[PDB]
Amino acid sequence: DKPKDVSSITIIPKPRLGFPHGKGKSDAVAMRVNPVALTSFQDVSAYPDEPRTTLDIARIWGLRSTFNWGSGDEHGKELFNTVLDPGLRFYDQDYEGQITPMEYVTGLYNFWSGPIELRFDFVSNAFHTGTVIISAEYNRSSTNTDECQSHSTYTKTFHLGEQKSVHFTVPYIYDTVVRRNTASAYLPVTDYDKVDNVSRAQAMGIRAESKMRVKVRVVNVLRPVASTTSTIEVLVYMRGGKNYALHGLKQSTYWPSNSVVPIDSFPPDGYDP
Amino acid sequence: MDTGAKEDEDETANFSDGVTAMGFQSLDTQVSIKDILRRPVLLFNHVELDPDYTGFFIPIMPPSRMMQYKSGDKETSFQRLIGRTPQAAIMNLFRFWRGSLRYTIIIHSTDGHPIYVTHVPHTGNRVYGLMKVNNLHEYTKVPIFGCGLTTEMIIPSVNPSICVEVPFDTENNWAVTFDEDAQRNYSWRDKGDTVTGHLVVTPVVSVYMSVWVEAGDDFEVSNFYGPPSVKTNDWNYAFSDEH
Amino acid sequence: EVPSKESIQGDATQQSSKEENTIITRDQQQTVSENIPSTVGDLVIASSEPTQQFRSLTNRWMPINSIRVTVNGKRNDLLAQYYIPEDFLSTHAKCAPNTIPFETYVYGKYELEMKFVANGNKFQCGKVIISVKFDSYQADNINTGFQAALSRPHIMLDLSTNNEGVLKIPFRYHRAFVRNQTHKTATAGVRPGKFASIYVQVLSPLQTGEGGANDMFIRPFYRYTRAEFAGMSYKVPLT
């Protein structure tokens, strides 16, 4: 018999399946003998200690900055003062160097949120003594010479002595549940084009600069014994808090600045000396 | 990966850890490294396919600094923003990868000519672009897609695009993601360990194509290297919200 | 962990490590990196014949070259760097019994441990960082700063407290085995003897007091916690 088949359905044609997505379905065709065979990870597989998410990477302590503290720094003096924006280290100049893991990874997103952690490591010895006060300041800032304005915020006073390190969790206090990155979502400039206002007026966005700052001021002047160094370096580490969040994949704000050479064809492109 | 928590010995009081904002706006979480690597990256934007060559070669390797454009260097057929895509940024942190990659190839045409995509397993070289294998001057009688290697065909009049998944056909446990200098002439067997083979696209008549790449489902990265030295000049190209 | 009051020999509360016929004591605390896994499952396939271990020779502590740290060292400076196992065979502690098996086997899988002992005085200060980079051939000059070191398996040394540090190094390589020796008859297509790099870098410059010493020293010690050899051959001198 050759009965007619009356089954039918209306269809909407599309060229690809799951093109924009990072998960879901794919209509990829395997260049294999068996269309469903896959790579084996039975013996060779990702080591369990490798990071699995960008948040894991953001949880790695990175050295952000350093500053000096000497026996000559009078009380109230700002030893450290910075806008704490994981989106950009500077709003008025280029950055080049070893960015921290959390800033590197934050540079891939348009939004971030949650507390940020700092760790101050005083490169000193048991004969250095003094006290500093760390403060997280929001919305409105303090004068460099008005220590009291810093003391009115979220503070942690550290008594430097036998212990040479102090941890500080920077509270997340803003008028929005998340904050938008100050870097750009797309920057087509590749040849360091001398910029003008028309270029800026036609940028991908408008930089919402942060006013949130973290400062470290002298409480009790550093008083090391004469036999040791009178000035010490303080290392400032930074990483995302346990509830740090990231969202909105975009063009990476940071890019390799050292030893960058694009591939050529090997051995066709003159590898045969 | 070593978090460094081991070096944080302070145990004095701290402010609250708060509550995460993940999932507050939506459930579209985008922090999974594999999820990020599975979204497509443009490699070649409207490049030419010429039938006088064996085909256009695409080395099987994920996006990374190996394809980064540097102002002033010679012009290649690679799109210039590959080095700043989130996935290239991620790959620049992992020197090992294992598994398959998926290539989305689009032929700018509506003709009924078949365009073939042939897979070449790991053979030791690393090339890209149009090439005349063994420097001959005619390839229609000795087509690479007709030699025995796995091949798939695109027929633009039906669908000018296709998505092919290439296997991890190599002798090594892991493929090496990148080198400090992609043009250094060092030990030849090691030189070819940054790819797992090639994909070759061959047309009937001259035509253009575009190519995107992404990680397959059976894919893993490892050998975390930590972050490299970076740069940024974003600040200079936009106004702040205070004029 | 806790000091005691002074007696005839001072504060006698040292700890120590004994591995084979070698012992190393420590006066203060010690920092240790995480014990992490190596690739397993390829050994029985890459080698049709059984692989070997010689623990009494390889698992003992062997001191390598002395490292000098001076007040002129800047952050990020390389104080020392090792391509392993290569540098432990033909450049540092060359007559060590730990090197014996490498003279006759052509392949191997290696898991090590490196202990670092520093001796700065109480009026000095500074920070040094030691890290490992797996399968580093042709990728030593990138992801090579203190930042990358702080992200990879590492140990930190404070130059005035003299805490010891132990770096645990698993075998993570893109091939099943690493080749042990180069040879006039061996191929030049594959650079052998290197599956990882160890970097010793300045994190914060050494500083001293008035009329104090302008330098101090650090000494690295290595030992294999698991060295498996494959492919027996005639013995050859190392590199």
């Binding site: - | 250094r184 002439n185 030990s187 | 400076d77 760097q81 090792y82 042709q138 650079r191």
Partner: peptide
């Protein structure tokens, strides 16, 4: 020719990579 091809002799080993003895590379 291409300056990337070979590393200068004073900074490299026989394998055309930085020598582990060459500390100034950073």
């Amino acid at each position: 020719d291409n300056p990337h091809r070979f590393l200068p002799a004073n900074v490299s080993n026989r394998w055309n990579e930085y020598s582990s003895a060459y500390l100034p590379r950073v």
